């Protein structure tokens, strides 16, 4: 909403400040052209220095949702929402998100009425095996980019109100500020759910004078 906040000057907060003075203060008619002009720089900054990385990044190569395979999307979701140390999903709504995506994968690549291979999302407590099952049943999904409709569906369910906000930036558009800023305070207490357990990516509220 534009209110000042005192935060520790981490790389993530420094990126926040840079965007504040370079992107988020732009008028509406200039926001999209600027994002489009700066896509590569913005994506690299997100992946390097922020707690919400660019979602469509496969093995360090920046991409788009339209340029990812279904399998790549599923694995990226598991990589960003599933904690290996605790062997659990950080929260159950992200589990539901990934399960919804896998159900859509099955719907896209199935030829007739069939039983879902994910009967209960509780099967996703071992995400690797569930992904292997889904993409062994539908191997064509490992080498086909997302149908445009499924891109739209993915971005729609990134905007689900009854769901913890997704821990990544999925698209650059008029709602980039919302994607970048929303739900930014929990990561300080749960570094196990940050990309490299890196505190420098997170935002920590602290007073300047009281810091002494």
């Amino acid at each position: 909403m534009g209110e000042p906040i005192h935060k520790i000057a981490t790389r993530g907060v420094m990126l926040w400040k840079e965007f504040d003075e370079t992107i988020f203060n732009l008028p509406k008619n200039k926001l999209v052209p600027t994002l489009e002009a700066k896509r590569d720089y913005i994506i690299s900054r997100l992946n390097a220095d922020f707690q919400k990385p660019w979602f469509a990044t496969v093995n360090g190569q920046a991409r788009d949702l339209a340029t990812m395979t279904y399998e790549e999307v599923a694995k990226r979701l598991v990589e960003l929402m599933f904690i290996r140390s605790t062997n659990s999903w950080f929260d159950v709504t992200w589990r539901t998100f990934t399960g919804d995506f896998l159900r859509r994968v099955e719907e896209r690549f199935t030829k007739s009425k069939t039983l879902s291979l994910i009967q209960s999302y509780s099967l996703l407590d071992k995400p690797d095996e569930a992904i292997e099952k889904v993409f062994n049943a539908y191997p064509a999904a490992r080498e086909q980019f997302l149908n445009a409709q499924d891109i739209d569906h993915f971005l729609s369910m990134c905007q689900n109100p009854m769901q913890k906000p997704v821990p990544f930036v999925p698209v650059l558009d008029r709602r980039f500020e919302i994607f970048f800023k929303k739900d930014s305070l929990w990561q300080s207490e749960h570094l196990e759910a940050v990309v490299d357990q890196d505190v420098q990516r997170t935002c920590i509220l602290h007073g300047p004078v009281a810091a002494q």
Binding site: R108, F109, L115, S116, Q149, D152
Partner: protein
């Protein structure tokens, strides 16, 4: 004592590029002496094709020609060509919706339901049929 999820097919239209075999099989098909015998600047190939006709595109026309009836992908393509269905992405009756809607009523349509909703009208208004004055300036 007190108190299975089924998955519906969604149309996945393919471009149908030619399948490319391993070099071993493809080498088996043509004489071994053909390698380096031909001036490939003098060999003409077809790299793409298309059509607009009474049975829609080349994909839907071929489905009708070879199999006599439309698959799910063919039915969805014919429905979209004829303007029966249109894509929607946004709030629809408040709730968000991503998918096909009936072009006239704007009600959501599942891919599985396209055949039941539309196939009969698609077939009635495709191919050789009585001349429709509205298509030819009265």
């Amino acid at each position: 004592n007190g108190n299975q999820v089924e998955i519906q097919p969604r149309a996945n239209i393919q471009l149908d590029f030619p399948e490319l075999k391993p070099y071993k099989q493809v080498k088996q098909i043509a004489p071994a002496e053909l390698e380096g015998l031909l001036d490939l600047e003098r060999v003409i190939v077809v790299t793409g094709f298309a059509e607009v006709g009474p049975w829609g595109s080349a994909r839907t026309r071929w489905e009708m020609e070879a199999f006599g009836e439309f698959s799910l992908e063919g039915c969805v393509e014919m429905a979209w060509i004829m303007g029966f269905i249109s894509y929607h992405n946004g709030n629809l009756k408040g709730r968000p919706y991503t998918g096909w809607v009936d072009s006239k009523t704007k009600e959501p349509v599942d891919d599985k339901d396209v055949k039941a909703k539309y196939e009969t009208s698609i077939l009635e208004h495709s191919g050789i049929r009585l001349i429709e004055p509205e298509l030819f300036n009265g």
